[PDB]
Design a protein around this ligand. Structure first.
Ligand SMILES: *[C@@H]1O[C@H](CO)[C@@H](O[C@@H]2O[C@H](CO)[C@@H](O)[C@H](O)[C@H]2NC(C)=O)[C@H](O)[C@H]1NC(C)=O
Ligand SMILES: *[C@@H]1O[C@H](CO)[C@@H](O[C@H]2O[C@H](CO)[C@@H](O)[C@H](O)[C@H]2NC(C)=O)[C@H](O)[C@H]1NC(C)=O
Lengths: 118, 193
């Protein structure tokens, strides 16, 4: 019960989101957005990456829609938010529409997680 | 006393989950009671249970499934008894189906096979099945076999000959999620050579 809560639940939403985006690829591929430059998942305490990356996913939430897509976004965010305190490290904006970003964002959110777990 | 239990069913209809609660002691007419749950939810903070006949329950996609959530019994506004539960621990799977036994005169055994809709799911995938079977002669004497796949085999010389057998299966969350047993799959009846 320490990291299991991720793959068993949290990672579920992350993958379902990535799948709906399998059709995205070459067209925009690497744009090197400021975010991945500034914040990075460095072995040197990488929980600070997800604590930010979490709030950032919060910028794709429209007029509080009830789609499976938004919901997974909530889950991955809130889920990552809450999974952070319980898992140690812890403490106490406009809008985004770019899916090429959202994707990379999820890739990383995916990587860093198991990076801290494994 | 207002003791009550609840069971969840993840991805029960499509990708939406269900939560069903009941009162322990059978009584109280057209109660002013109603159920609520807060925490571990997403869009909303709290959700209102519906009330059908004698049971209460909800169907949302809003269950986060991370950490506990407050489920309280309430009247008008007066909160009575609450209860912090983690929905991933009270999962009742859907019963198995397409149960069937095949006899092979070649190898002298009985091949038990069945299906579960949990295999094509995303959360509660891993299950622990329980095959049970009794004889016409006996009545409440069943013998269970705890499998982990959808195929079992029973050798001819392991149970009475010319005997007619009743067989059934049920499932339970066997991994990260915890919970109760599934209802029993309808029974299959076959006769032994
Ligand atoms: C086990 O049961 C499932 C659910 O009923 C079956 O799912 C089939 O899935 C295919 C797509 O891959 C559909 O075209 C079929 O319509 C589904 N079957 C049904 C319900 O008609 C699955 O095939 C079953 N597998 C076994 C071993 O019997
Ligand atoms: C069936 O149970 C209900 C309880 O909901 C009884 O209703 C009474 O008790 C309520 C619970 O405290 C109160 O709100 C009221 O005192 C009253 N309800 C009404 C009518 O407002 C009800 O009497 C029971 N059945 C009967 C009629 O015997």
């Amino acid at each position: 019960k320490d990291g299991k809560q991720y793959e068993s639940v949290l990672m579920v939403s992350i993958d379902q989101l990535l799948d709906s985006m399998k059709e995205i690829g070459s067209n925009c591929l690497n744009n090197e957005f400021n975010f991945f430059k500034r914040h990075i998942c460095d072995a040197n305490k990488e929980g600070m990456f997800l604590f930010r990356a979490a709030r950032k996913l919060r910028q794709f939430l429209k007029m509080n829609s009830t789609g499976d897509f938004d919901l997974h976004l909530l889950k991955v965010s809130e889920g990552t938010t809450i999974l952070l305190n319980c898992t140690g490290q812890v403490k106490g904006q406009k809008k985004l529409n770019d899916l090429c970003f959202l994707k990379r964002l999820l890739q990383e959110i995916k990587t860093c997680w198991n990076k801290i777990l494994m | 006393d207002y003791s009550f239990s609840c069971y969840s069913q993840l991805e029960v209809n499509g990708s939406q989950h269900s939560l069903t609660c009941a009162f322990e002691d059978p009584d109280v007419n057209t109660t002013n009671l109603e159920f609520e749950i807060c925490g571990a939810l997403v869009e909303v903070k709290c959700l209102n249970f519906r009330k059908l006949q004698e049971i209460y329950f909800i169907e949302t996609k809003k269950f986060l499934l991370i950490g506990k959530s407050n489920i309280c019994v309430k009247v008008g506004e007066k909160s009575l008894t609450c209860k912090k539960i983690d929905l991933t621990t009270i999962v009742k799977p859907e019963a198995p189906f397409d149960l069937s036994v095949v006899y092979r005169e070649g190898a002298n055994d009985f091949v038990v096979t069945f299906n579960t809709s949990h295999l094509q799911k995303k959360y509660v995938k891993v299950l622990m099945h329980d095959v049970a079977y009794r004889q016409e002669k006996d009545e409440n004497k069943w013998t269970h076999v705890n499998l982990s796949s959808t195929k079992l085999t029973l050798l001819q010389r392991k149970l009475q000959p010319a005997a007619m057998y009743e067989i059934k299966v049920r499932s339970i969350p066997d991994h990260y999620f915890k919970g109760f047993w599934s209802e029993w799959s309808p029974s299959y009846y076959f006769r032994t050579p």
